[PDB]
Structure formats: structure tokens, C-alpha cells
């Protein structure tokens, strides 16, 4: 009920957050009883908004649905409501406005980029009463949400999956925008280079080993403190290699001690056989002596008789000894047959085992849009505990429906490439040009600038966008440290379905480690017959240089080897993405690079405050703000993350330029 509302908003139901503490210091420092009243009001308001996100939830309409005693304190309710509204926890996205927007605007904000982060912030700012204009370099909106549309064919070249609805803000958006969400069937069969499937046994054996190897790197990091090597941050790739090398070492160590047990025992045999051979000689010589003494025929003196009798006894004793040694000979002989029949494992992983493992590594390289040797060992999975619950889905009608819908009613200047960002104590001015005719210049004056340029663009050297004055070192250093990955897609449009329709995805196992991410995975998720191929890891960057024909050629080859040469027709339509080359992206999405950490995401999010114009003048207002996937530590590299960063900055900007009434 109210607890689900908190969960769906990424909030603890029974506790106040740091953000809430800042706006309600009176309540958090006060008695527990009052804190409980606040929590209920907050959760209930969230629930109301969540129950019907198609219409604006006003303060009036909120007080209405609340029962006593909660509905007694009208100010506390009003405060909580405004707080939620301002921070975009309620009334965000595309909803029917009950109170038509006041025609009179306050403040002027220029937003650089019209991707999801920029669009989300714009809606919020416009909704707050500010003058908002967005500048997009492309001839469209959505940025990294790029949908290919030709006829009935629909395929996403950028973001494609909604990663669980539980706690995901995209769930609200999906009720506001007609999104044909379809569950992803987890079943993923693999096909080796030769085109033959991988048996259930191996598939599971390698996958389990893969997870075991990752868990091992975690141990190696947290317990053995292997995080720095040669004054360099250890990468996930390095850690995996070391772990694998050590598993190969153990296999060899077990082998050695097994063959050493054999020799030790075989040396026990050597000694025993040496005894037996000498004893057999002793027995032979004694037998002769007895026979010679036995010759002397009765009757004989007592010494001659003693000789016979004594040698008889001595021989009996020695014959008993030999029998006991022969008893021991049979025990060791079979002990050796048992050991020789019990060899330990020959290899840690066979060539085929390694190739299948490389597919899992490629899969991980896809997830993080980067080769494993670039990922921070200590932090690559820092955002793990924030994953949403529920099954992963795809946008069957193309993800672009989201940005397009969010663009409705906004002032967006397309084909406008921002070139320079000037920010001072009295305001800002952004210099941009027409992408179609670069000489045509545009000047935009504003009170604040919200920068949503991708990390790739911010990294560009020489820079594509100049900041005046330059960004401070703390900001640029973060930019240099943070990783900006790459991953590409190959859209293959056909006229007929020649694949297993109940199978959403299937993999192709590359021959070598180097090419593991090369067209390693195929997606079958749309209405029309379309196959989407992934290019991850080191392959992504290299394949951008290869032409479409050659890429499609390789795709066809792979599919032929799997479905038969006379079953794969020549594609009617093909598209290949090149995110790194794309001047407005220069990569796909951020990753936690070795040497970086979740803290850099926070640094990326901090606004910039210019120095004073007049010396000795009071401390200016922050003027330059940042949003975007690379500015949200808990959900980076995602659509929801971008969306949330936009909502965050809108609240901070509004608080700064329109003032906060709910803090008092």
C-alpha cells in the first residue's frame, strides 16, 4: 500500500532520507511520533500520484484524500506536497494539467541537449514557471534513445531495455506514454563458431564457473586487498586473469602431488621387491644346505640331527617372512592400480571451455559497454544494490516514443550545435551555430545553463564545447577519470522468420578471446522479422572502421552456420550504429573505470559558481548545472538514470531561482 509507494519511489518507508532531513530539519530532529506522521503523509501522497499518474496531483486534491488526524495539519501536508512536487517525485512526466500554466514566466534557463535528461528537466522547469529553451545539435530529440523506423520495421539503436518496473520511474512514464512493453524470455542458447549448439551440461558448467570467477575477484579485492599493482588501479580484467592463472596452477599442483604419491608408493615397492629378491636367495641357499644335511642318512649323531632340524626350522621361518612380504606386495600393487585409475583433472578449462567463457565475458563487456581491462575492480558493481525488481522488458513500439512525447510543448532548437558556454556573476550566454550552415551564429542569454552533454563530448580533445571561464580542475579531473564506453548494434531486417520464435535471444561464440564481443549476441524482439546483433568490448571500437557490407557479411555467415546456408535470405534493410564516431555522443554510456569511483559521479553532478565580476562583491549564485547519465551514481548508464538526473537538476535550479517556500 503506502509501503509500495515508497519502494516505487526508491525511498525507505519507515525512515526519513537525507534530502528530507534537509528540508524538514524540525521534523527529523523532533520526536519519533511526528516523524511517523510525516512518513505517512509522504507515502500516501506518493501512493495517490502513483495510483493515477495521468493527471496532476494538486495540494487541494491531496488534503481531500487524507483522513484524520493526518489531514488536520494543513501546513505540514502543503510542505510535504510541495517538497515532492519540487523534487519531481510526484507530477513529473506527461500528465494532464489541472491548473493551466500561468502565462507569466520567472527566470530564463538554457538546456544543452534534448536527450532524456534534458527533456525531463525542461518539463519540470516549464511546469515550475520558468522560461526554458533547449538546444539540440541533432535533427531530432532523444539523443542516445535512437529508434530506427522504416515501414513496419522498428529497431532501437540506443537504449532498448527497461530493466525492471519495481522502483523504476519508467513505470510511471509507461502509463503516461503508450509503451508496448514486452517481457524478455531469459532462455538464451549459444552456438559455437562451427554453428553447433552448446549442450545443456557445458552451458551450465561454464556459466557457474563464470559466476564463480567473478565472486573470486570480489574476494581478491575485499579480502586480499589486491587493488593496486605497479602504482596502477587493478582492473576487473587483470583480476580475472590472475584468478584463472591460479586455477590453472591448482590443477597443475594437484597433478604433481598425485604423481608424487605414485612414486612414493612405487618406491615402497622397489624396497619391498629388493627385500624379497634377497630373501628368495637366502631361502634358496638354505634349502640347499638342508638338502645336504638331509643327505647324511640315519642313524646319525645328535649334531648332525640338530643340523637337519635347525635348518628345517630356519627355513620355515624365512618362508613365513617371504609370504608376509608377498602379502604386502599385493597390497601396494593394487594401491598403484587404484591411483593410476584416479587421475585428477587434466586442464582447468579446455579450448572449447575457454571460448564459451569468453562469451560470458563479452556479455559482461556488453553490459558495461567496455573491455573488462578498463573496469575498476573495486567499484565496477557499485550500483548493484539499486537494481530494480521485475522482469526486463523491451519497447516494442520503439523507445523514441518516450522522448518524442516528452518534447510536446517545449521550445526546442534542433540543428543547433552549442559551441561556447559563458557564465558570470550576472548571468550566462551560450554561443551555438547552425549545423547545416556553421557560419550562422546564435546567442542565448540566460540566468542559468543546464549542461547535459554526454561524458564523451565533455572528454573531447581538443574540446568541442568551450567553457568560459574554463571548468575547474576538480570538474575536469572527474571528466578525465570517468570511463566512457562503447557498444554497437547491427539491425538486420528480413521478409520472413527463420529463427526460433519463442527464443528472444541467442548467442554466437567467437573463435578467439580478441573477437569475443564481435556479433556475439542476437536479439529477436519486434513485431516484424528483425534480428539485432551486438558488438561489444574491444570489437565495438575496431568494427566502427569496418564498412556495413563487410559487417553484414559476417552477420550472414554466422547465421548461415546456425540456420543453414539455404535459409538465410539477403536482408531487405540494414543499419549499423557507430556511437564512438558520433560527434554528439562519442561513445555509448559511462562505466566505472579503474582509478575512478562512485564519487566522480557526484563531482560530475555539482553545479559551478562563477567568481565575482566586481572585486569584493558578494558570493554569486551557481550558474552552470549538470545532468545526464554520467551525473547519477546510483543509476548511471541508463534511461531512468538520465531521467532522474534531469528531475534532480530541475529541483535544484528552481530552488535556486524561484526560492523554496517549504524549507521554512
Amino acid at each position: 500500500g503506502v509501503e509500495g509507494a515508497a519502494f516505487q519511489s526508491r525511498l525507505p518507508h519507515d525512515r526519513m532520507t537525507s534530502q528530507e532531513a534537509a528540508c524538514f530539519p524540525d521534523i527529523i530532529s523532533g520526536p519519533q511520533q511526528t516523524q511517523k506522521v510525516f512518513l505517512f503523509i509522504r507515502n500516501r501522497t506518493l501512493q495517490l500520484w502513483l495510483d493515477n499518474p495521468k493527471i496532476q496531483l494538486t495540494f487541494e486534491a491531496t488534503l481531500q484524500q487524507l483522513e484524520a488526524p493526518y489531514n488536520s495539519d494543513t501546513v505540514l501536508v502543503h510542505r510535504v506536497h510541495s517538497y515532492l512536487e519540487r523534487h519531481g517525485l510526484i507530477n513529473f512526466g506527461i500528465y494532464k494539467r489541472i491548473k493551466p500554466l500561468p502565462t507569466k514566466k520567472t527566470g530564463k534557463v538554457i538546456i544543452i541537449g534534448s536527450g532524456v535528461s534534458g527533456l525531463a528537466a525542461a518539463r519540470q522547469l516549464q511546469s515550475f514557471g520558468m522560461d526554458v529553451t533547449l538546444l539540440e545539435a541533432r535533427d531530432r530529440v532523444g539523443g542516445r534513445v535512437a529508434t530506427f523506423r522504416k515501414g513496419n520495421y522498428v529497431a532501437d539503436l540506443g537504449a532498448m531495455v527497461v530493466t525492471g518496473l519495481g522502483g523504476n520511474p519508467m513505470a510511471v512514464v509507461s502509463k503516461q506514454v503508450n509503451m508496448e512493453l514486452a517481457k524478455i524470455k531469459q532462455k538464451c542458447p549459444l552456438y559455437e563458431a562451427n554453428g553447433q549448439a552448446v549442450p545443456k551440461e557445458k552451458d551450465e558448467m561454464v556459466e557457474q564457473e563464470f559466476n564463480r570467477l567473478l565472486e573470486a575477484t570480489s574476494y581478491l579485492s575485499h579480502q586480499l586487498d589486491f587493488n593496486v599493482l605497479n602504482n596502477k588501479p587493478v582492473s576487473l580484467g587483470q583480476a580475472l586473469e590472475v584468478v584463472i592463472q591460479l586455477q590453472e596452477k591448482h590443477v597443475k599442483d594437484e597433478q604433481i602431488e598425485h604423481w608424487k604419491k605414485i612414486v612414493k608408493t612405487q618406491e615402497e615397492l622397489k624396497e619391498l621387491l629388493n627385500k624379497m629378491v634377497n630373501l628368495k636367495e637366502k631361502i634358496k641357499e638354505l634349502h640347499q644346505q638342508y638338502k645336504e644335511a638331509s643327505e647324511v642318512k640315519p642313524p646319525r649323531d645328535i649334531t648332525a640331527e640338530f643340523l637337519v632340524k635347525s635348518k628345517h626350522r630356519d627355513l620355515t621361518a624365512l618362508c613365513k617372512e617371504y609370504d608376509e612380504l608377498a602379502e604386502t606386495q599385493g597390497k601396494l600393487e593394487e594401491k598403484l592400480q587404484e591411483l593410476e585409475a584416479n587421475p585428477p583433472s587434466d586442464v582447468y578449462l579446455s579450448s572449447r571451455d575457454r571460448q564459451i567463457l569468453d562469451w560470458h565475458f563479452a556479455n559482461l563487456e556488453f553490459a558495461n559497454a567496455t573491455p573488462l581491462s578498463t573496469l575498476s575492480l573495486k567499484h565496477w558493481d557499485q550500483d548493484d544494490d539499486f537494481e530494480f525488481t521485475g522482469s526486463h522488458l523491451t519497447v516494442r513500439n520503439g523507445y523514441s516514443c518516450v522522448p518524442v512525447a516528452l518534447a510536446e510543448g517545449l521550445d526546442i532548437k534542433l540543428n543547433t550545435a552549442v559551441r561556447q558556454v559563458r557564465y558570470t556573476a550576472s548571468g550566462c550566454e551560450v554561443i551555438a551555430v547552425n549545423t547545416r550552415s556553421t557560419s550562422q551564429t546564435f546567442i542565448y542569454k540566460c540566468d542559468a545553463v543546464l549542461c547535459t552533454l554526454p561524458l564523451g563530448v565533455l572528454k573531447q580533445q581538443p574540446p568541442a564545447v568551450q567553457f568560459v571561464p574554463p571548468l575547474p580542475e576538480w570538474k575536469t579531473s572527474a571528466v578525465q577519470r570517468m570511463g566512457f564506453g562503447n557498444l554497437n548494434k547491427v539491425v538486420l531486417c528480413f521478409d520472413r522468420v527463420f529463427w526460433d520464435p519463442s527464443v528472444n535471444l541467442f548467442g554466437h561464440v567467437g573463435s578467439t578471446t580478441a573477437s569475443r564481443g564481435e556479433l556475439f549476441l542476437f536479439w529477436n524482439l519486434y513485431k516484424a522479422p528483425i534480428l539485432l546483433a551486438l558488438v561489444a568490448g574491444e570489437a565495438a571500437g575496431i568494427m566502427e572502421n569496418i564498412s556495413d557490407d563487410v559487417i553484414v557479411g559476417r552477420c550472414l555467415a554466422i547465421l548461415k552456420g546456425i540456420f543453414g546456408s539455404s535459409a538465410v535470405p539477403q536482408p531487405k534493410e540494414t543499419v549499423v550504429s557507430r556511437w564512438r564516431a558520433d560527434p554528439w555522443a562519442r561513445g555509448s554510456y559511462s562505466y566505472v573505470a579503474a582509478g575512478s569511483s562512485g564519487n566522480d559521479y557526484d563531482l560530475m553532478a555539482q553545479p559551478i559558481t562563477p567568481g565575482p565580476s566586481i572585486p569584493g562583491a558578494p558570493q554569486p549564485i551557481p550558474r552552470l548545472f549538470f545532468a545526464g547519465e554520467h551525473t547519477i551514481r546510483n543509476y548511471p548508464a541508463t534511461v531512468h538514470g538520465a531521467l532522474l538526473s534531469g528531475l534532480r537538476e530541475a529541483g535544484r535550479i528552481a530552488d535556486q531561482f524561484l526560492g523554496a517556500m517549504y524549507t521554512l
Binding site: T163, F366, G390, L505, A637
Partner: peptide, 7 residues
């Protein structure tokens, strides 16, 4: 951010 296709 690990594997992705899970729950």
C-alpha cells in the same frame, strides 16, 4: 551493472 538479463 552485471550481466543485465536477470531479475
Amino acid at each position: 551493472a552485471r550481466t543485465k538479463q536477470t531479475a
